[PDB]
PDB file of C-alpha atoms in Angstrom:
ATOM      1  CA  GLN A   2      50.928  12.034 136.594  1.00  0.00           C
ATOM      2  CA  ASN A   3      51.150   9.391 133.859  1.00  0.00           C
ATOM      3  CA  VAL A   4      49.495   9.814 130.475  1.00  0.00           C
ATOM      4  CA  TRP A   5      52.070   7.488 128.886  1.00  0.00           C
ATOM      5  CA  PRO A   6      51.876   4.724 127.850  1.00  0.00           C
ATOM      6  CA  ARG A   7      48.668   5.497 125.987  1.00  0.00           C
ATOM      7  CA  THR A   8      46.704   3.747 123.249  1.00  0.00           C
ATOM      8  CA  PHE A   9      45.903   5.437 119.930  1.00  0.00           C
ATOM      9  CA  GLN A  10      42.707   4.590 118.043  1.00  0.00           C
ATOM     10  CA  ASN A  11      43.692   3.867 114.452  1.00  0.00           C
ATOM     11  CA  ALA A  12      41.367   4.870 111.631  1.00  0.00           C
ATOM     12  CA  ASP A  13      40.488   1.230 110.875  1.00  0.00           C
ATOM     13  CA  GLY A  14      39.410   0.540 114.447  1.00  0.00           C
ATOM     14  CA  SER A  15      42.707  -1.123 115.366  1.00  0.00           C
ATOM     15  CA  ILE A  16      44.820   0.271 118.200  1.00  0.00           C
ATOM     16  CA  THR A  17      48.467   1.058 118.793  1.00  0.00           C
ATOM     17  CA  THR A  18      50.078   1.438 122.201  1.00  0.00           C
ATOM     18  CA  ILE A  19      52.607   4.249 122.371  1.00  0.00           C
ATOM     19  CA  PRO A  20      54.967   3.616 125.318  1.00  0.00           C
ATOM     20  CA  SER A  21      56.294   7.180 125.675  1.00  0.00           C
ATOM     21  CA  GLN A  22      55.947  10.635 124.055  1.00  0.00           C
ATOM     22  CA  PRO A  23      57.376  10.415 120.513  1.00  0.00           C
ATOM     23  CA  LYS A  24      60.296  12.721 119.792  1.00  0.00           C
ATOM     24  CA  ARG A  25      61.366  11.108 116.501  1.00  0.00           C
ATOM     25  CA  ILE A  26      58.299  10.965 114.275  1.00  0.00           C
ATOM     26  CA  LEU A  27      58.622   9.510 110.790  1.00  0.00           C
ATOM     27  CA  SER A  28      55.770  10.063 108.308  1.00  0.00           C
ATOM     28  CA  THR A  29      55.147   7.476 105.573  1.00  0.00           C
ATOM     29  CA  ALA A  30      52.438   9.712 104.079  1.00  0.00           C
ATOM     30  CA  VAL A  31      53.414  13.006 102.445  1.00  0.00           C
ATOM     31  CA  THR A  32      49.859  14.300 102.883  1.00  0.00           C
ATOM     32  CA  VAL A  33      49.881  13.748 106.643  1.00  0.00           C
ATOM     33  CA  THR A  34      53.182  15.535 107.046  1.00  0.00           C
ATOM     34  CA  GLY A  35      51.507  18.900 106.415  1.00  0.00           C
ATOM     35  CA  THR A  36      49.422  18.508 109.570  1.00  0.00           C
ATOM     36  CA  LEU A  37      52.290  17.152 111.624  1.00  0.00           C
ATOM     37  CA  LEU A  38      54.110  20.391 110.752  1.00  0.00           C
ATOM     38  CA  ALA A  39      50.964  22.389 111.510  1.00  0.00           C
ATOM     39  CA  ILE A  40      51.043  21.343 115.171  1.00  0.00           C
ATOM     40  CA  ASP A  41      54.831  21.549 115.413  1.00  0.00           C
ATOM     41  CA  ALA A  42      55.247  17.818 115.972  1.00  0.00           C
ATOM     42  CA  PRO A  43      58.851  16.506 116.068  1.00  0.00           C
ATOM     43  CA  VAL A  44      58.896  15.072 112.532  1.00  0.00           C
ATOM     44  CA  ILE A  45      62.396  13.923 111.595  1.00  0.00           C
ATOM     45  CA  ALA A  46      61.606  12.468 108.165  1.00  0.00           C
ATOM     46  CA  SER A  47      58.774  12.244 105.641  1.00  0.00           C
ATOM     47  CA  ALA A  48      57.986  10.273 102.525  1.00  0.00           C
ATOM     48  CA  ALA A  49      57.232  12.340  99.417  1.00  0.00           C
ATOM     49  CA  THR A  50      54.852  12.619  96.462  1.00  0.00           C
ATOM     50  CA  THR A  51      55.050  10.110  93.612  1.00  0.00           C
ATOM     51  CA  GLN A  52      57.254  12.783  92.009  1.00  0.00           C
ATOM     52  CA  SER A  53      59.710  12.756  94.942  1.00  0.00           C
ATOM     53  CA  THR A  54      58.687  16.139  96.359  1.00  0.00           C
ATOM     54  CA  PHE A  55      57.223  17.669  99.480  1.00  0.00           C
ATOM     55  CA  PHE A  56      53.911  19.464  98.878  1.00  0.00           C
ATOM     56  CA  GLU A  57      54.754  23.025  97.894  1.00  0.00           C
ATOM     57  CA  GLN A  58      52.465  24.695 100.526  1.00  0.00           C
ATOM     58  CA  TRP A  59      54.873  23.494 103.235  1.00  0.00           C
ATOM     59  CA  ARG A  60      58.019  22.253 101.479  1.00  0.00           C
ATOM     60  CA  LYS A  61      60.056  25.287 102.611  1.00  0.00           C
ATOM     61  CA  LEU A  62      58.975  24.783 106.205  1.00  0.00           C
ATOM     62  CA  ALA A  63      59.938  21.108 106.088  1.00  0.00           C
ATOM     63  CA  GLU A  64      63.360  22.047 104.697  1.00  0.00           C
ATOM     64  CA  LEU A  65      63.802  24.751 107.354  1.00  0.00           C
ATOM     65  CA  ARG A  66      62.994  22.184 110.056  1.00  0.00           C
ATOM     66  CA  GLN A  67      65.430  19.778 108.373  1.00  0.00           C
ATOM     67  CA  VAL A  68      62.808  17.103 107.751  1.00  0.00           C
ATOM     68  CA  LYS A  69      64.598  14.380 105.784  1.00  0.00           C
ATOM     69  CA  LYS A  70      62.827  13.608 102.491  1.00  0.00           C
ATOM     70  CA  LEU A  71      62.420   9.868 102.063  1.00  0.00           C
ATOM     71  CA  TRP A  72      60.917   7.698  99.299  1.00  0.00           C
ATOM     72  CA  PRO A  73      58.394   8.732  96.649  1.00  0.00           C
ATOM     73  CA  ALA A  74      54.843   7.517  97.291  1.00  0.00           C
ATOM     74  CA  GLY A  75      54.493   4.012  95.886  1.00  0.00           C
ATOM     75  CA  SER A  76      58.005   2.918  96.879  1.00  0.00           C
ATOM     76  CA  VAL A  77      58.006   2.483 100.649  1.00  0.00           C
ATOM     77  CA  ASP A  78      61.565   1.776 101.763  1.00  0.00           C
ATOM     78  CA  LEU A  79      61.437  -0.244 104.976  1.00  0.00           C
ATOM     79  CA  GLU A  80      65.193  -0.165 105.448  1.00  0.00           C
ATOM     80  CA  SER A  81      65.350   3.628 105.372  1.00  0.00           C
ATOM     81  CA  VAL A  82      62.701   3.678 108.103  1.00  0.00           C
ATOM     82  CA  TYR A  83      64.825   1.407 110.284  1.00  0.00           C
ATOM     83  CA  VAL A  84      67.811   3.721 109.738  1.00  0.00           C
ATOM     84  CA  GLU A  85      65.948   6.820 110.874  1.00  0.00           C
ATOM     85  CA  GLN A  86      65.403   5.263 114.340  1.00  0.00           C
ATOM     86  CA  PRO A  87      61.848   6.654 114.645  1.00  0.00           C
ATOM     87  CA  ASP A  88      59.783   6.284 117.823  1.00  0.00           C
ATOM     88  CA  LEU A  89      56.501   6.877 116.002  1.00  0.00           C
ATOM     89  CA  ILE A  90      55.632   5.901 112.415  1.00  0.00           C
ATOM     90  CA  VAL A  91      52.600   7.526 110.790  1.00  0.00           C
ATOM     91  CA  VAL A  92      50.625   5.802 107.979  1.00  0.00           C
ATOM     92  CA  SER A  93      47.648   7.021 105.881  1.00  0.00           C
ATOM     93  CA  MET A  94      44.683   4.718 105.203  1.00  0.00           C
ATOM     94  CA  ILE A  95      43.624   5.865 101.744  1.00  0.00           C
ATOM     95  CA  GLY A  96      45.665   7.285  98.907  1.00  0.00           C
ATOM     96  CA  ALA A  97      48.760   7.020  96.740  1.00  0.00           C
ATOM     97  CA  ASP A  98      50.850   7.862  99.818  1.00  0.00           C
ATOM     98  CA  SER A  99      49.263   5.011 101.854  1.00  0.00           C
ATOM     99  CA  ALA A 100      51.613   2.414 103.351  1.00  0.00           C
ATOM    100  CA  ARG A 101      48.684   0.582 104.972  1.00  0.00           C
ATOM    101  CA  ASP A 102      49.733  -2.819 103.565  1.00  0.00           C
ATOM    102  CA  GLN A 103      53.154  -2.444 105.241  1.00  0.00           C
ATOM    103  CA  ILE A 104      51.804  -1.819 108.759  1.00  0.00           C
ATOM    104  CA  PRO A 105      52.906  -5.229 110.130  1.00  0.00           C
ATOM    105  CA  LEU A 106      56.470  -4.657 108.922  1.00  0.00           C
ATOM    106  CA  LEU A 107      56.470  -1.058 110.154  1.00  0.00           C
ATOM    107  CA  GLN A 108      55.139  -2.003 113.589  1.00  0.00           C
ATOM    108  CA  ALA A 109      58.196  -4.266 113.943  1.00  0.00           C
ATOM    109  CA  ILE A 110      60.367  -1.132 113.825  1.00  0.00           C
ATOM    110  CA  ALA A 111      58.388   1.308 116.006  1.00  0.00           C
ATOM    111  CA  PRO A 112      54.859   2.105 117.188  1.00  0.00           C
ATOM    112  CA  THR A 113      52.916   2.597 113.970  1.00  0.00           C
ATOM    113  CA  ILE A 114      49.607   4.470 113.746  1.00  0.00           C
ATOM    114  CA  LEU A 115      47.055   4.630 110.966  1.00  0.00           C
ATOM    115  CA  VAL A 116      45.207   7.845 110.167  1.00  0.00           C
ATOM    116  CA  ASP A 117      42.736   8.859 107.461  1.00  0.00           C
ATOM    117  CA  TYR A 118      42.953  12.288 105.828  1.00  0.00           C
ATOM    118  CA  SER A 119      40.603  11.512 102.966  1.00  0.00           C
ATOM    119  CA  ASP A 120      37.369  11.643 104.993  1.00  0.00           C
ATOM    120  CA  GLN A 121      37.926  14.529 107.407  1.00  0.00           C
ATOM    121  CA  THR A 122      39.292  18.053 107.685  1.00  0.00           C
ATOM    122  CA  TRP A 123      42.925  18.800 108.581  1.00  0.00           C
ATOM    123  CA  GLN A 124      41.542  20.119 111.872  1.00  0.00           C
ATOM    124  CA  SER A 125      39.927  16.791 112.769  1.00  0.00           C
ATOM    125  CA  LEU A 126      43.157  15.066 111.753  1.00  0.00           C
ATOM    126  CA  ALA A 127      45.160  17.512 113.873  1.00  0.00           C
ATOM    127  CA  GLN A 128      43.220  16.551 116.995  1.00  0.00           C
ATOM    128  CA  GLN A 129      44.044  12.857 116.493  1.00  0.00           C
ATOM    129  CA  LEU A 130      47.709  13.601 115.769  1.00  0.00           C
ATOM    130  CA  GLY A 131      47.793  15.552 119.044  1.00  0.00           C
ATOM    131  CA  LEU A 132      46.747  12.419 120.923  1.00  0.00           C
ATOM    132  CA  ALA A 133      49.462  10.339 119.284  1.00  0.00           C
ATOM    133  CA  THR A 134      52.137  12.909 120.076  1.00  0.00           C
ATOM    134  CA  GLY A 135      51.088  14.461 123.403  1.00  0.00           C
ATOM    135  CA  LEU A 136      50.493  17.764 121.588  1.00  0.00           C
ATOM    136  CA  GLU A 137      46.765  18.062 122.272  1.00  0.00           C
ATOM    137  CA  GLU A 138      47.212  21.648 123.512  1.00  0.00           C
ATOM    138  CA  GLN A 139      49.241  22.630 120.438  1.00  0.00           C
ATOM    139  CA  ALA A 140      46.658  21.065 118.122  1.00  0.00           C
ATOM    140  CA  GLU A 141      43.859  23.046 119.743  1.00  0.00           C
ATOM    141  CA  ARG A 142      45.935  26.232 119.654  1.00  0.00           C
ATOM    142  CA  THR A 143      46.666  25.872 115.946  1.00  0.00           C
ATOM    143  CA  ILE A 144      43.032  25.123 115.156  1.00  0.00           C
ATOM    144  CA  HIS A 145      41.696  27.922 117.337  1.00  0.00           C
ATOM    145  CA  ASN A 146      44.186  30.554 116.230  1.00  0.00           C
ATOM    146  CA  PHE A 147      43.171  29.692 112.676  1.00  0.00           C
ATOM    147  CA  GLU A 148      39.459  30.021 113.469  1.00  0.00           C
ATOM    148  CA  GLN A 149      40.000  33.400 115.101  1.00  0.00           C
ATOM    149  CA  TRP A 150      41.964  34.446 112.021  1.00  0.00           C
ATOM    150  CA  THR A 151      39.144  33.574 109.649  1.00  0.00           C
ATOM    151  CA  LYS A 152      36.782  35.558 111.880  1.00  0.00           C
ATOM    152  CA  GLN A 153      39.098  38.570 111.636  1.00  0.00           C
ATOM    153  CA  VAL A 154      39.377  38.179 107.847  1.00  0.00           C
ATOM    154  CA  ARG A 155      35.606  37.807 107.469  1.00  0.00           C
ATOM    155  CA  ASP A 156      35.276  41.292 108.943  1.00  0.00           C
ATOM    156  CA  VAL A 157      37.603  43.009 106.457  1.00  0.00           C
ATOM    157  CA  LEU A 158      36.803  41.344 103.128  1.00  0.00           C
ATOM    158  CA  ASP A 159      34.698  43.227 100.598  1.00  0.00           C
ATOM    159  CA  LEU A 160      33.390  40.338  98.516  1.00  0.00           C
ATOM    160  CA  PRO A 161      31.467  40.651  95.234  1.00  0.00           C
ATOM    161  CA  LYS A 162      27.698  40.757  95.402  1.00  0.00           C
ATOM    162  CA  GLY A 163      25.926  37.383  95.422  1.00  0.00           C
ATOM    163  CA  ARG A 164      27.314  33.864  95.466  1.00  0.00           C
ATOM    164  CA  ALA A 165      30.409  32.020  94.366  1.00  0.00           C
ATOM    165  CA  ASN A 166      31.087  28.526  93.137  1.00  0.00           C
ATOM    166  CA  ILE A 167      34.237  26.430  93.467  1.00  0.00           C
ATOM    167  CA  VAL A 168      35.241  24.637  90.299  1.00  0.00           C
ATOM    168  CA  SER A 169      37.936  22.198  89.252  1.00  0.00           C
ATOM    169  CA  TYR A 170      38.186  22.939  85.536  1.00  0.00           C
ATOM    170  CA  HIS A 171      39.705  20.469  83.062  1.00  0.00           C
ATOM    171  CA  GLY A 172      37.927  21.703  79.949  1.00  0.00           C
ATOM    172  CA  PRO A 173      35.759  19.974  77.330  1.00  0.00           C
ATOM    173  CA  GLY A 174      35.575  16.222  76.726  1.00  0.00           C
ATOM    174  CA  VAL A 175      36.641  15.325  80.249  1.00  0.00           C
ATOM    175  CA  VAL A 176      35.146  15.020  83.733  1.00  0.00           C
ATOM    176  CA  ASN A 177      35.253  18.331  85.645  1.00  0.00           C
ATOM    177  CA  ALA A 178      34.235  18.927  89.268  1.00  0.00           C
ATOM    178  CA  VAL A 179      32.505  21.307  91.644  1.00  0.00           C
ATOM    179  CA  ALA A 180      33.174  21.516  95.379  1.00  0.00           C
ATOM    180  CA  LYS A 181      30.435  19.962  97.568  1.00  0.00           C
ATOM    181  CA  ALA A 182      28.707  21.700 100.479  1.00  0.00           C
ATOM    182  CA  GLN A 183      30.625  19.678 103.110  1.00  0.00           C
ATOM    183  CA  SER A 184      33.981  20.019 101.375  1.00  0.00           C
ATOM    184  CA  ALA A 185      36.908  21.535 103.216  1.00  0.00           C
ATOM    185  CA  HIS A 186      37.007  24.180 100.451  1.00  0.00           C
ATOM    186  CA  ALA A 187      33.401  25.213 100.898  1.00  0.00           C
ATOM    187  CA  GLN A 188      33.748  25.363 104.706  1.00  0.00           C
ATOM    188  CA  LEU A 189      36.868  27.509 104.459  1.00  0.00           C
ATOM    189  CA  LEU A 190      35.389  30.066 102.061  1.00  0.00           C
ATOM    190  CA  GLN A 191      32.120  30.150 103.988  1.00  0.00           C
ATOM    191  CA  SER A 192      34.099  30.875 107.171  1.00  0.00           C
ATOM    192  CA  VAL A 193      35.282  34.180 105.661  1.00  0.00           C
ATOM    193  CA  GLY A 194      31.861  35.220 104.359  1.00  0.00           C
ATOM    194  CA  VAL A 195      31.595  33.645 100.912  1.00  0.00           C
ATOM    195  CA  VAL A 196      28.085  32.471 100.088  1.00  0.00           C
ATOM    196  CA  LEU A 197      28.246  29.324  97.992  1.00  0.00           C
ATOM    197  CA  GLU A 198      26.316  27.875  95.093  1.00  0.00           C
ATOM    198  CA  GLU A 199      26.230  24.108  95.618  1.00  0.00           C
ATOM    199  CA  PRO A 200      26.294  21.586  92.743  1.00  0.00           C
ATOM    200  CA  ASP A 201      23.346  19.331  91.884  1.00  0.00           C
ATOM    201  CA  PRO A 202      24.229  15.878  93.201  1.00  0.00           C
ATOM    202  CA  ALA A 203      22.327  14.515  90.194  1.00  0.00           C
ATOM    203  CA  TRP A 204      25.348  15.697  88.177  1.00  0.00           C
ATOM    204  CA  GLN A 205      27.427  12.831  89.598  1.00  0.00           C
ATOM    205  CA  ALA A 206      29.487  11.213  86.816  1.00  0.00           C
ATOM    206  CA  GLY A 207      31.053   7.778  87.169  1.00  0.00           C
ATOM    207  CA  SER A 208      31.475   5.825  90.397  1.00  0.00           C
ATOM    208  CA  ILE A 209      34.403   7.520  92.109  1.00  0.00           C
ATOM    209  CA  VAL A 210      33.161   9.718  94.965  1.00  0.00           C
ATOM    210  CA  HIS A 211      35.162  12.156  97.109  1.00  0.00           C
ATOM    211  CA  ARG A 212      34.385  14.202 100.204  1.00  0.00           C
ATOM    212  CA  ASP A 213      35.453  17.499  98.612  1.00  0.00           C
ATOM    213  CA  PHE A 214      34.370  17.319  94.974  1.00  0.00           C
ATOM    214  CA  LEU A 215      31.395  16.206  92.959  1.00  0.00           C
ATOM    215  CA  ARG A 216      32.751  14.860  89.683  1.00  0.00           C
ATOM    216  CA  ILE A 217      30.615  15.877  86.702  1.00  0.00           C
ATOM    217  CA  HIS A 218      30.321  15.897  82.927  1.00  0.00           C
ATOM    218  CA  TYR A 219      31.732  19.081  81.398  1.00  0.00           C
ATOM    219  CA  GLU A 220      28.321  20.008  79.963  1.00  0.00           C
ATOM    220  CA  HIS A 221      26.941  20.753  83.438  1.00  0.00           C
ATOM    221  CA  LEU A 222      29.349  23.667  83.852  1.00  0.00           C
ATOM    222  CA  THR A 223      27.054  25.786  81.676  1.00  0.00           C
ATOM    223  CA  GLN A 224      24.337  25.473  84.359  1.00  0.00           C
ATOM    224  CA  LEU A 225      26.337  27.302  87.054  1.00  0.00           C
ATOM    225  CA  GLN A 226      24.663  30.518  88.234  1.00  0.00           C
ATOM    226  CA  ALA A 227      27.048  32.117  90.753  1.00  0.00           C
ATOM    227  CA  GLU A 228      28.336  35.620  90.083  1.00  0.00           C
ATOM    228  CA  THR A 229      31.835  34.533  91.127  1.00  0.00           C
ATOM    229  CA  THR A 230      33.938  31.466  90.366  1.00  0.00           C
ATOM    230  CA  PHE A 231      36.960  30.191  92.280  1.00  0.00           C
ATOM    231  CA  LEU A 232      39.165  27.742  90.388  1.00  0.00           C
ATOM    232  CA  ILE A 233      40.906  24.812  92.082  1.00  0.00           C
ATOM    233  CA  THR A 234      44.646  24.268  91.543  1.00  0.00           C
ATOM    234  CA  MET A 235      44.889  27.312  89.263  1.00  0.00           C
ATOM    235  CA  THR A 236      46.671  30.658  89.137  1.00  0.00           C
ATOM    236  CA  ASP A 237      44.896  33.610  87.520  1.00  0.00           C
ATOM    237  CA  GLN A 238      47.042  33.085  84.424  1.00  0.00           C
ATOM    238  CA  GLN A 239      45.752  29.518  84.183  1.00  0.00           C
ATOM    239  CA  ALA A 240      42.212  30.756  84.885  1.00  0.00           C
ATOM    240  CA  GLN A 241      42.275  32.424  81.456  1.00  0.00           C
ATOM    241  CA  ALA A 242      41.442  29.088  79.858  1.00  0.00           C
ATOM    242  CA  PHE A 243      38.181  29.081  81.821  1.00  0.00           C
ATOM    243  CA  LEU A 244      37.388  32.730  81.054  1.00  0.00           C
ATOM    244  CA  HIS A 245      38.054  32.160  77.347  1.00  0.00           C
ATOM    245  CA  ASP A 246      36.191  28.858  76.969  1.00  0.00           C
ATOM    246  CA  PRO A 247      33.621  29.749  74.269  1.00  0.00           C
ATOM    247  CA  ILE A 248      31.069  27.276  75.612  1.00  0.00           C
ATOM    248  CA  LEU A 249      31.210  28.999  79.001  1.00  0.00           C
ATOM    249  CA  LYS A 250      30.950  32.567  77.712  1.00  0.00           C
ATOM    250  CA  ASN A 251      27.496  33.121  79.249  1.00  0.00           C
ATOM    251  CA  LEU A 252      28.361  32.110  82.814  1.00  0.00           C
ATOM    252  CA  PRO A 253      27.550  34.998  85.149  1.00  0.00           C
ATOM    253  CA  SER A 254      31.035  34.874  86.692  1.00  0.00           C
ATOM    254  CA  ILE A 255      32.600  35.154  83.228  1.00  0.00           C
ATOM    255  CA  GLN A 256      30.221  37.964  82.220  1.00  0.00           C
ATOM    256  CA  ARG A 257      31.289  39.835  85.369  1.00  0.00           C
ATOM    257  CA  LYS A 258      34.987  38.987  84.973  1.00  0.00           C
ATOM    258  CA  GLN A 259      34.867  37.543  88.511  1.00  0.00           C
ATOM    259  CA  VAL A 260      36.847  34.370  87.917  1.00  0.00           C
ATOM    260  CA  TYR A 261      39.732  33.834  90.306  1.00  0.00           C
ATOM    261  CA  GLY A 262      42.331  31.139  90.797  1.00  0.00           C
ATOM    262  CA  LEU A 263      42.455  29.612  94.265  1.00  0.00           C
ATOM    263  CA  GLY A 264      46.138  28.928  93.710  1.00  0.00           C
ATOM    264  CA  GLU A 265      48.425  26.099  92.691  1.00  0.00           C
ATOM    265  CA  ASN A 266      48.215  24.300  96.035  1.00  0.00           C
ATOM    266  CA  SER A 267      44.432  24.405  96.528  1.00  0.00           C
ATOM    267  CA  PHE A 268      43.499  20.840  95.523  1.00  0.00           C
ATOM    268  CA  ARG A 269      43.584  19.748  99.167  1.00  0.00           C
ATOM    269  CA  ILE A 270      43.062  21.912 102.236  1.00  0.00           C
ATOM    270  CA  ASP A 271      45.582  21.846 105.041  1.00  0.00           C
ATOM    271  CA  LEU A 272      46.738  24.649 107.326  1.00  0.00           C
ATOM    272  CA  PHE A 273      49.289  25.876 104.846  1.00  0.00           C
ATOM    273  CA  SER A 274      47.260  25.749 101.619  1.00  0.00           C
ATOM    274  CA  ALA A 275      44.301  27.199 103.536  1.00  0.00           C
ATOM    275  CA  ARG A 276      46.586  30.022 104.671  1.00  0.00           C
ATOM    276  CA  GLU A 277      47.604  30.679 101.057  1.00  0.00           C
ATOM    277  CA  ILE A 278      43.953  30.687 100.000  1.00  0.00           C
ATOM    278  CA  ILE A 279      42.835  33.040 102.746  1.00  0.00           C
ATOM    279  CA  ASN A 280      45.838  35.283 102.002  1.00  0.00           C
ATOM    280  CA  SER A 281      44.712  35.530  98.354  1.00  0.00           C
ATOM    281  CA  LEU A 282      41.228  36.575  99.454  1.00  0.00           C
ATOM    282  CA  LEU A 283      42.736  39.305 101.642  1.00  0.00           C
ATOM    283  CA  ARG A 284      44.878  40.643  98.809  1.00  0.00           C
ATOM    284  CA  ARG A 285      41.989  40.637  96.314  1.00  0.00           C
ATOM    285  CA  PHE A 286      39.117  41.846  98.462  1.00  0.00           C
ATOM    286  CA  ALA A 287      40.334  43.600 101.644  1.00  0.00           C
ATOM    287  CA  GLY A 288      42.256  46.566 100.260  1.00  0.00           C
ATOM    288  CA  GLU A 289      44.796  48.149 102.586  1.00  0.00           C
ATOM    289  CA  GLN A 290      43.355  46.136 105.484  1.00  0.00           C
ATOM    290  CA  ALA A 291      44.677  43.164 103.511  1.00  0.00           C
ATOM    291  CA  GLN A 292      48.366  43.303 104.321  1.00  0.00           C
ATOM    292  CA  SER A 293      48.404  43.307 108.120  1.00  0.00           C
ATOM    293  CA  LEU A 294      46.271  40.153 108.235  1.00  0.00           C
ATOM    294  CA  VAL A 295      48.296  38.230 105.629  1.00  0.00           C
ATOM    295  CA  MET A 296      49.987  35.264 107.311  1.00  0.00           C
ATOM    296  CA  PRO A 297      53.513  34.016 106.551  1.00  0.00           C
ATOM    297  CA  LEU A 298      54.517  30.363 106.195  1.00  0.00           C
ATOM    298  CA  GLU A 299      56.073  30.812 109.627  1.00  0.00           C
ATOM    299  CA  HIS A 300      57.491  33.446 111.964  1.00  0.00           C
ATOM    300  CA  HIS A 301      59.449  33.681 115.223  1.00  0.00           C
ATOM    301  CA  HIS A 302      61.672  30.821 114.085  1.00  0.00           C
TER     302      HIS A 302
END
């Protein structure tokens, strides 16, 4: 019968023994909280962004589930963790929201696990979170339902002819970026039928490398060939700056007026920002097939 206690494999190759199924999960990493919510884990409290907020893709869901907002990233409050009486404490390995250095102190309060969201998809992260929480079946269900959804959406979209690129636009005089072939963004769009133009890895600027984005000198933007451009972290209103950038006036996507914001929450892909992104593709490209496939933040509360 027993699958508790169990031992969780932390992202750094350490381990953490979890004596019983956690029912009071506290997240020290605002980024991880999105995926805890995605699999309906019993999260009772979560740390926040440096700006003391929950990520907007899921904030409303966290508030609805009464997830207590804790400290802003960068100011881990060990005493508030003690107060929450957690039975599982979740820490990220890499990022502003990472409480990795506090693991020894955290482990003194409750079983503390270490996960990495920076180097894998939310889906891969969801599977690991399922093991830590006994929600393996829920993780798979969430992942699979989502996959089936993208298959359904793929069938109803009427995308522009040709290819698209995925750009993070900051304008002239500054490093810009293009989504890489293995990025979560590229995989998501490809899953609903978008055919992508990939960036030249030679364009790499500086020494900071990320899984999702190739960082590049602004001047390389003029070399993009795709007939469509999707803009990271931008609304269509904000996209105007890209459309009206005189240096970019010859881009095929600008010539065709096929430049589209991926939305304010599209920097990082989790279930909820992915949902928003896919919803925007339905509304733009699926016509009156669009609405019935649009997915809410949640339903059947």
